[PDB]
Amino acid sequence: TNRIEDPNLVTDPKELAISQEMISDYNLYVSMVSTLTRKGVGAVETLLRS
């Protein structure tokens, strides 16, 4: 958020190229934590309903 509110960061190609990476890495991280958590509880559920 700060990297976007601040006007000298959001308008210099050097800084934008870095922010693009930060955003993508955030996305991937959260998506993987979510996936593995679901797989985990789903295993418990599969065994106990069997």
Q: Given candidates 12, 16, 18, 25, which one binds other proteins under the rule CB under 8 A?
A: 25
Q: Based on the shown chain and the rule CB under 8 A, indicate whether residue 11 belongs to the binding site for other proteins.
A: no
Tokens 């509880």: give the residue.
41
Tokens 């210099």: give the residue.
12
Half-sphere exposure of 44 (CA within 13 A, CB side): 5
Question: Do 42 and 35 contact (CB within 8 A), yes or no?
Answer: no
Q: What's the closest the beta carbon of residue 14 comes to other proteins, in angstroms? A: 16
Q: Based on the shown chain and the rule CB under 8 A, indicate whether residue 8 belongs to the binding site for other proteins.
A: yes
The residues of the shown chain that bind other proteins, judged by CB under 8 A, are 1-2, 7-10, 19, 23, 25-27, 29-30, 33-50
